Design a protein around this ligand. Structure first.
Ligand code: ZN
Ligand code: ZN
Lengths: 155, 155
């Protein structure tokens, strides 16, 4: 049924916006990536959200005070960006840097299970880009939102 | 989010009505069971659907020509009956009798796989009630709709 395919899309929307809303209200910062290149940033600085746009040389090319813009309205703007090009448009929520350690042909965060000991000292601080391919990540300590468009590990 | 819980319930409704609608348009007969006891029957006889209500002694106590009633409108009436008491109200679609055979601590229908040989002759014709507990059926030859309220095997 077409009505069921529409209902499924509007439900996915409501759930992905709610996910983004909560991520923005918690971490206060989201990176927008197109083909695993950061193209924008929305960060709560002061008492407002600021929308930074970057060029291919990772130079700040724009800075916009979203002023009154709510977390929920920004979440909707971010979904509208994703759904236009869902195979290439992904978002990173939180501090860009993650401590990761390689062992037994898997990469580890130690988020959902302490796979690595003295992790804090044996780990390396690494940018978001490596999380684009979920296949290399340990399924015991590293979990992700069911949404393929959220690159950042859940917790 | 409450709106997501409501959207999920309306989507389950649309999917379960569409499932019932198709089952009615195919087999033309549905048994309504409450605690695995047949309490009603909707069957396409002639050019209309007829609604037979039974008592605990399986006696026809009523027969109602639904007249103009469409399969979609009847599917909706059957959903409204289910969702009132979803743990006890199930439906059987098609011929009440199914050929079943016991082997290797599993019951077989030979629907999705030829589990049994000379099945047609080694099998026994059996009412719907045994399909209430899905735990006892070969998962290779016997499949059910994801909807727990449709007792009858898919195909
Ligand atoms: Zn691990
Ligand atoms: Zn079988």
């Amino acid at each position: 049924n077409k009505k069921i395919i529409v209902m499924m899309a509007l439900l996915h929307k409501e759930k992905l916006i709610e996910c983004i809303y909560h991520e923005l209200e918690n971490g206060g910062t989201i990176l927008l990536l197109t083909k695993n290149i950061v193209v924008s940033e929305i960060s709560y600085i002061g008492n407002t959200y600021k929308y930074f746009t970057f060029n291919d040389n990772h130079d700040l090319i724009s800075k916009e005070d979203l002023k009154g813009a709510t977390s929920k309205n920004i979440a909707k703007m971010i979904y509208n960006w994703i759904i236009k090009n869902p195979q290439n448009n992904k978002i990173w929520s939180g501090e860009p840097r993650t401590q990761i350690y390689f062992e037994n042909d898997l990469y580890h965060t130690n988020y959902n299970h302490k796979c690595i000991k003295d992790f804090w000292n044996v780990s390396t601080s690494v940018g978001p880009h490596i999380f684009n391919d979920r296949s290399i990540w340990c399924t015991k300590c590293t979990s992700f939102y069911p949404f393929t468009n959220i690159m950042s590990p859940n917790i």
